[PDB]
Specification:
With 309 residues, the protein is mainly beta. It is 4% helix and 21% strand. Among the domains are: 169 residues, Receptor L-domain (24 nucleotide stem-loop, u2 snrnp hairpin iv. U2 a', Chain A, Alpha-Beta Horseshoe); 44 residues, Hormone Receptor, Insulin-like Growth Factor Receptor 1, Chain A, domain 2 (Hormone Receptor, Insulin-like Growth Factor Receptor 1, Chain A domain 2, Ribbon), CATH 2.10.220.10. It is elongated, with a radius of gyration of 27 Å. The structure holds a molecule of 3 linked components (NAG-NAG-BMA) and 2-acetamido-2-deoxy-beta-D-glucopyranose (2 copies). It is classed as transferase.
């Protein structure tokens, strides 16, 4: 189900969250397993102080991790407070898209103000469909200058206000710069898994120097600059590559047996065929699979009736 299944939850101010100022200790659990937010998210200081007027205890920082399943927010994301023990927004490390159909002050779709974080860490963020971005007053925040926000924007006129964060020179002098394996499009943090996009190729969500084409385990092939694992029936080749693509039909050399174009662990024994009959096969000396005698309804080890005594 592509990780967590698609679960749409209401934003702050709608439905079960009507008349709520902020994500807070009472309502955070109602975002459990949400993947899309129909509305806005607000995270304010009160969330972490507690609020006696609304019978709200202080929010436990660990529970912010409940937001790790959020992939989409259709409105805006406003973060004006964050736990002191958290150097980034890894709660939102899986957020992919902010659509910005509603905007703070009718302007901003992402706003990150007055935090102590040292990086943003929105490592999955790829699109801010509409609305401006504001990142200001984050006195320890680096890396924000490196993003080419145009790669995320999809509307004319979108703009960033990135100001009063840690100084550029200061960030460079303390080594807070994009990893060498990042492309020039910038980064969300110092790690190779924080790149907006890769210099060379990626493996999962990490940027790397090269796929395992001729050495290394497991062997891989390159699919649109991504390292994709080779099928395990493909025998690794000391000289050659091992695959031309995915599946057991794209091996250079099969590892166990050969059923036509398929490399396979064991010759088929009972699979379904084109007919009211099951397909039974056996392996010869050269580990090629061959149909068994038709009268061999429970399989075979060699050709002929002798194969099914
Ligand atoms: C923290 O989150 C909780 C839950 O999301 C918020 O609690 C909600 O607070 C509002 C008032 O602030 C309550 O709304 C009122 O409900 C009554 C009774 O149904 C209704 O007659 C009023 O018209 C109004 O809608 C709501 O019941 C309450 N819900 C729960 C589950 O407690 C809380 O306010 C949030 N606090 C902060 C500081 O963000
Ligand atoms: C999502 O919810 C299911 C139960 O509804 C739970 O088993 C699973 O652990 C949850 N996902 C995470 C990441 O906790
Ligand atoms: C990765 O890309 C950089 C920049 O184009 C290049 O200098 C380097 O040789 C590349 N390495 C590999 C393994 O492709």
């Amino acid at each position: 189900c592509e990780g967590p299944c698609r679960k749409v939850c209401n934003g702050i101010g709608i439905g079960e969250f009507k008349d709520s100022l902020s994500i807070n200790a009472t309502n955070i659990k109602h975002f459990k397993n949400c993947t899309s937010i129909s509305g806005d998210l607000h995270i304010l200081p009160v969330a972490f102080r507690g609020d006696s007027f609304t019978h709200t205890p202080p929010l436990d920082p660990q529970e912010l991790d409940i937001l790790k399943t959020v992939k989409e927010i259709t409105g805006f994301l406003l973060i004006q407070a964050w736990p002191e023990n958290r150097t980034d927004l890894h709660a939102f490390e899986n957020l992919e898209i902010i659509r910005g159909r509603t905007k703070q002050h009718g302007q901003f779709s992402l706003a990150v103000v007055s935090l102590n974080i040292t990086s943003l860490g929105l490592r999955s963020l790829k699109e801010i469909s509409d609305g401006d971005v504001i990142i200001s007053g984050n006195k320890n925040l680096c890396y924000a200058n490196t993003i080419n926000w145009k790669k995320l924007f999809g509307t004319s006129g979108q703009k960033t206000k990135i100001i009063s964060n840690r100084g550029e020179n200061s960030c460079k002098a303390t080594g807070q710069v994009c990893h060498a394996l990042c492309s020039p499009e910038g980064c969300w943090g110092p790690e190779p898994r924080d790149c907006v996009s890769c210099r060379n190729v990626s493996r999962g969500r990490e940027c790397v120097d090269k796929c395992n084409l001729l050495e290394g385990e497991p062997r891989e092939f390159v699919e649109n600059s991504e390292c994709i694992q080779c099928h395990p029936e493909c025998l690794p080749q000391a000289m050659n590559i091992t695959c031309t693509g995915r599946g057991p039909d794209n091996c250079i050399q099969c590892a166990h047996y050969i059923d036509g174009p398929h490399c396979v662990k064991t010759c088929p024994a009972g699979v379904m065929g084109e007919n009211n009959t099951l397909v039974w096969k056996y392996a010869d000396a050269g580990h090629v699979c061959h149909l068994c005698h038709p009268n061999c309804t429970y399989g075979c080890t060699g050709p002929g009736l002798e194969g099914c005594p």
